[PDB]
């Protein structure tokens, strides 16, 4: 559904001085398909001096599409347009105009038209896709001082659209200190989903606009110690090298972006898992309770009155910062924020005291998958001796049809079967034991390349599918799949499932499983 | 050689000045339910061949606009309820039986210019009909003789069961499925995403051997070849 009806540059609107189309066949400086040839200007066309058209999919009358496009893509007044024709064809149109003869805002002749570059889509578009096409057109259609219909960039663009689904990204991603989610979310979208622009603008702590392409490059013809301070544990050095590449160069990024890149191999496994499929976890608090020593005034102030009008005044008013002041004001600011990261921010000794005091008083606690660190963002919150880890999204292998000796059902502690100190909950080490041992050196990360499809099933089973298929209640399936790893007789007792896959009873395989149990 | 006959029912048209042998009265044995109703037939062109059609389409538009007063405010005026639902009542089986009442006397006045026999009922129904037992058994025994009946549904929306079906109306809800009838749907001409198969309306406020639901049914066409030749 990410298809490609047409990307076209028709010479529909040549209104200028000399040395092109005007009343002859189609002809321009450095490009003349002429003398009455097939005349191609559209998407899938073999392109050199000579050229060949192809017509593949637009779900309409294609010569009518061309002859209506000629007169239905030109605009007289500038700007960018959009045309939704019938239910399943759209045109996100992008003209621009630069009409001047020898003004050049030296060449052989002014051959400058109303520009006519446009790509299409059918019937289920996305404003992100629309913004992508706007930005690509703005970067394509600039000046080209000597006019050059370089169609090699057209061929790279036509391969760019179908080839790579994602727009632009980076394998090297930065960090979430105290500032990066706010610096993301205050405009939320500066220019065209650019991770590199995002981390660089936060990296020098200032906004600078050097252009970013999608996959084909189009040119327009300081180090602070706080970075390595907030990025000690995860990626300081090549990120500082990317700072050097962005304070020095532009467009010369894929030379230094990617090629700069028990416990140790599990650290690399944590990196290769944080690249795609495992999230981390934190906790927060809140001051909300009540109904009809230093806890009862706070409770009264929260109950019969609003809070910040009262409890923010007494703690300087008695000339003592103490337990109730530390419980009142910084914990209230942390309740304004609600990660534990500002408690990491504004401290020098509070980190061993804060949850102690929250257990001391009647503040309500909860634990959660952390705030909005979505996979359209880089990587948050570096690993330490304390951060807990759990994977959710990424799929894995299969147990019951293929009848592996390795049991992998996704149940509670999701994948049922000095040593991972940052493992907070059981899914992390259960998933990596279901991946592989810690013995292979480079074949281990070859197997991490292999776990896409995970030795090639797709798991349509989530431990309640067995209760769907047959009379496997909770007790029986846990008693069998908690020693499934050892001997496959208990496996084959269910994995003779071909016999109740050829049921010939046309109503119910549950009764036939129950009958085929003991024999 | 065509007829185009419109037919419908109304409820509570009990009596007026000498409109008595026109009404009928429907009832149910197992739960008592008895109402007055009345059947209307309005014919358009009766027995006439002509080329260059589509003028009947203009006359059927005229009769569609004239129809609700034409059926409501006639012979008896109690409180009228017009044009009852097909999935609740209907004069369908009686209409096919009256077409058979025409076709039994084919030997009376014999045209030398016609061979085949055809009766097509266009309904906006869903496929459900609530039908008396005796009329259904009687029309089985009468289509034993000369099979001529074809049903097509311009409602569309092919439901999630064996679509020609009869709930019995005898003097579990007793189902029946016919295998003598030739049903065909008419999908309209447009292209969208997921054609829903359900309606919804918000109120203000020993054997049981045929059920109709375990029978599988993908799509039914129009079968133009059994409607043109």
């Amino acid at each position: 559904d990410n298809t490609s009806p047409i990307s076209v540059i028709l010479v529909s609107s040549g209104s200028r001085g000399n040395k092109l189309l005007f009343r002859y066949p189609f002809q321009r400086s450095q490009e003349h398909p002429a003398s009455q040839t097939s005349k191609p200007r559209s998407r899938y066309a073999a392109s050199n001096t000579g050229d060949h058209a192809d017509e593949q999919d637009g779900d309409s009358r294609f010569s009518d599409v061309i002859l209506a496009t000629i007169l239905a893509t030109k605009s007289e007044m500038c700007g960018q347009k959009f045309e939704l024709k019938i239910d399943n064809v759209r045109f996100v149109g992008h003209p621009t105009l630069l009409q001047h003869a020898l003004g050049q805002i030296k060449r052989e002749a002014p051959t400058m038209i109303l520009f006519n570059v446009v790509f299409a889509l059918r019937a289920n578009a996305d404003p992100s896709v629309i913004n992508c096409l706007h930005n690509l057109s703005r970067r394509i259609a600039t000046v080209l001082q000597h006019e050059e219909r370089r169609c090699q960039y057209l061929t790279r663009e036509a391969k760019l659209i179908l080839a790579l689904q994602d727009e632009v990204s980076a394998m090297a991603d930065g960090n979430e200190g105290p500032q990066s989610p706010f610096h993301h979310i205050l405009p939320k979208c500066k220019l065209a989903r650019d991770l590199k622009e995002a981390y660089d603008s936060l990296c020098t702590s200032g906004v600078v606009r050097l252009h970013i392409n999608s996959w084909l490059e189009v040119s327009f013809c300081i180090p602070p110690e706080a970075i390595e301070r907030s990025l000690k544990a995860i990626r300081p050095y090549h990120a500082l090298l990317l700072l050097s590449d962005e304070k020095s160069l532009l467009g010369e990024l894929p030379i230094d972006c990617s090629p700069a890149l028990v416990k140790n191999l599990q650290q690399l496994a944590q990196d290769a898992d944080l690249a795609l499929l495992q999230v981390f976890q934190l906790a927060a608090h809140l001051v909300y309770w009540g109904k009809a020593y230093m806890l009862s005034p706070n409770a009264s102030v929260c109950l019969y009155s609003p809070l910040a009008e009262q409890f923010s005044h007494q703690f300087p008013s008695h000339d003592l910062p103490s337990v109730l002041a530390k419980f009142s004001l910084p914990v209230s600011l942390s309740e304004f924020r609600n990660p534990l990261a500002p408690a990491v921010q504004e401290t020098q000794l509070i980190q061993m005291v804060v949850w102690m005091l929250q257990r001391r008083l009647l503040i309500q606690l909860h634990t959660y998958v952390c705030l909005m660190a979505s996979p359209s963002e880089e990587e948050p919150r570096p690993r330490e001796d304390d951060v807990p880890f759990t994977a959710r999204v990424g799929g894995r292998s299969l147990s019951t049809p293929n009848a592996l000796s390795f049991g992998s059902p996704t149940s509670s502690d999701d994948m049922t079967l000095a040593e991972l100190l940052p493992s907070g909950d059981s899914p992390l080490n259960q998933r990596m034991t279901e991946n592989l041992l810690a013995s292979l050196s480079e074949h281990e990360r070859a197997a991490i390349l292999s776990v896409p499809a995970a030795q090639n099933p797709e798991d349509l089973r989530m431990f309640a599918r067995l209760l769907h298929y047959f009379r496997g209640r909770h007790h029986l399936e846990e008693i069998m799949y908690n020693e499934n790893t050892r001997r496959s007789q208990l496996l084959m007792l269910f994995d003779k499932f071909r016999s109740v896959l050829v049921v010939t009873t046309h109503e119910d395989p549950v009764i036939a499983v129950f009958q085929a149990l003991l024999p | 050689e065509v007829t185009v006959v419109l037919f419908s029912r109304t409820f509570y048209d009990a009596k007026s000045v000498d409109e008595f042998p026109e009404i009928n009265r429907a009832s149910i044995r197992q739960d008592h339910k008895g109402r007055f109703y009345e059947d209307f037939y309005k014919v358009v062109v009766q027995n006439e061949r002509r080329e260059e059609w589509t003028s009947l389409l203009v006359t059927i538009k005229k009769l569609f606009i004239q129809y609700p007063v034409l059926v409501r405010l006639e012979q008896a005026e109690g409180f009228p309820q017009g044009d009852n639902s097909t999935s609740a009542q209907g004069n369908y089986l009686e209409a096919i039986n009256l077409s058979f009442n025409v076709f039994d006397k084919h030997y009376i006045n014999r045209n030398f210019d016609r061979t085949g026999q055809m009766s097509v009922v266009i309904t906006p129904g869903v496929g459900v009909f609530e039908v008396d037992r005796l009329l259904m058994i009687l029309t089985k025994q009468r289509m034993i003789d000369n099979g001529i009946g074809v049903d097509l549904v311009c409602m569309g929306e092919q439901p999630l069961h064996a679509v020609p079906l009869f709930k019995l109306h005898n003097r579990g809800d007793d189902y029946n499925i016919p295998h003598w009838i030739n049903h065909s749907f008419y999908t309209s001409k447009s292209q969208l995403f997921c054609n829903s198969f359900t309606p919804r309306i918000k109120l203000a406020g020993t054997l049981s051997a045929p059920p109709v639901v375990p029978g599988f049914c993908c799509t039914v066409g129009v079968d133009w070849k059994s409607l043109t030749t």
Binding site: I86, A464, H468, D508 | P159, L160, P199
Partner: protein
């Protein structure tokens, strides 16, 4: 009142002494807009819908061409806001073009000019009554009463897998039980009986593909699916509660606010929120009833709705666990 139309226009390519006449009802079909949208209002391709964007708004239009000797060509256009939905206003304009076609082929409106003036109060009543309620019954003949309805055009529904659970967000007692399909009337009684594969052979005895299609259409209109309701946790019970245990996780799961495998921590770590925002269980016995089978009101929905009047706890609960 989501979509908001504002101007409706007819136009016609006049014989040569006039370019193109327009019949407007109130935006305004001004000079520069009609100049730059001139090329769409005459096309090779006819009888297709086409809408364009411009600085002020959006013409959704269709043109038609009839009476090929001194070839006549008209168009109906429907100009609305720049960024509204306007996906519910394509078939209405196309259907009006079809009605105008049959009106010209039966009685020839646009060859006599008093009917051309009569064509304008048609637009005024349409501009009132579309924004009034969204449907129009409008007689203009002894043989044509145009009928129009705004279809909401809801998005696609997801898949209905074989092991989920339906829940009515709405209430069954607000519809006509007599107005359903037969399959919906044979499913809808045991729809609170949670498991889908239970309810099919409990009451339905249908094809499982058929009950899948039926619950998918009820998901397309008014029924929300969720995952199964085996008692995962057991140890949430040592807090004191006032009879608020079963519907709790069903509601907050219907709010789509969890990672799925609830374990033993989800229920207590939000049950403190349920306790401050306000015989036996026979808990070993809901297990054999789970394969295929041949204060007065308990406060479970009232408290979440009366705090859904506020938004802090639904922030703290959309932020899931």
């Amino acid at each position: 009142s989501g979509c908001r139309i504002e101007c409706i226009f007819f136009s016609e390519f006049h014989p040569t002494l006039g370019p193109k006449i327009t019949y407007q009802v109130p935006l305004f079909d001004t000079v520069q807009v009609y100049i730059i949208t001139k090329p769409e209002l005459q096309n090779k391709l006819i009888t297709v819908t086409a809408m364009e964007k411009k600085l002020i708004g959006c013409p959704v239009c269709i043109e038609h061409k009839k009476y090929s000797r001194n070839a006549l060509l008209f168009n109906l256009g429907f100009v609305c806001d720049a960024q509204a939905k306007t996906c519910a206003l394509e078939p209405i304009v196309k259907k009006l073009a079809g009605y105008l076609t049959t009106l010209e082929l039966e009685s020839s409106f646009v060859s006599m000019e008093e009917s051309k003036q009569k064509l304008v109060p048609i637009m005024t009543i349409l501009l009132e009554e579309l924004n009034a309620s969204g449907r129009c019954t409008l007689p203009i003949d002894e043989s044509n009463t145009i009928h129009l309805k705004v279809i909401e055009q809801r998005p696609d529904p997801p898949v209905a897998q074989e092991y989920d659970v339906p829940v009515f967000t709405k209430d069954k007692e607000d519809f006509f039980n007599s107005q359903w399909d037969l399959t919906t009337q044979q499913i809808l009684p045991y729809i609170d009986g949670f498991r889908h594969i239970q309810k099919i052979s409990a009451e339905a005895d249908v094809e499982l593909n058929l009950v899948r299609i039926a619950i998918q259409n009820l998901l397309y209109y008014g029924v929300v699916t969720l995952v199964s309701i085996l008692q995962y946790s057991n140890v949430y019970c040592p807090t004191p509660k006032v009879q608020d245990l079963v519907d709790d996780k069903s509601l907050q799961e219907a709010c789509l606010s969890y990672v799925t495998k609830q374990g033993h921590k989800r229920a207590s770590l939000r049950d403190v929120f349920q306790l401050y925002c306000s015989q036996f269980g026979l808990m070993k016995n809901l297990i054999r009833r789970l394969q295929k089978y041949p204060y007065t009101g308990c406060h479970s929905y009232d408290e979440i709705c009366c705090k859904t009047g506020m938004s802090y706890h639904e922030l703290d609960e959309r932020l899931e666990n």
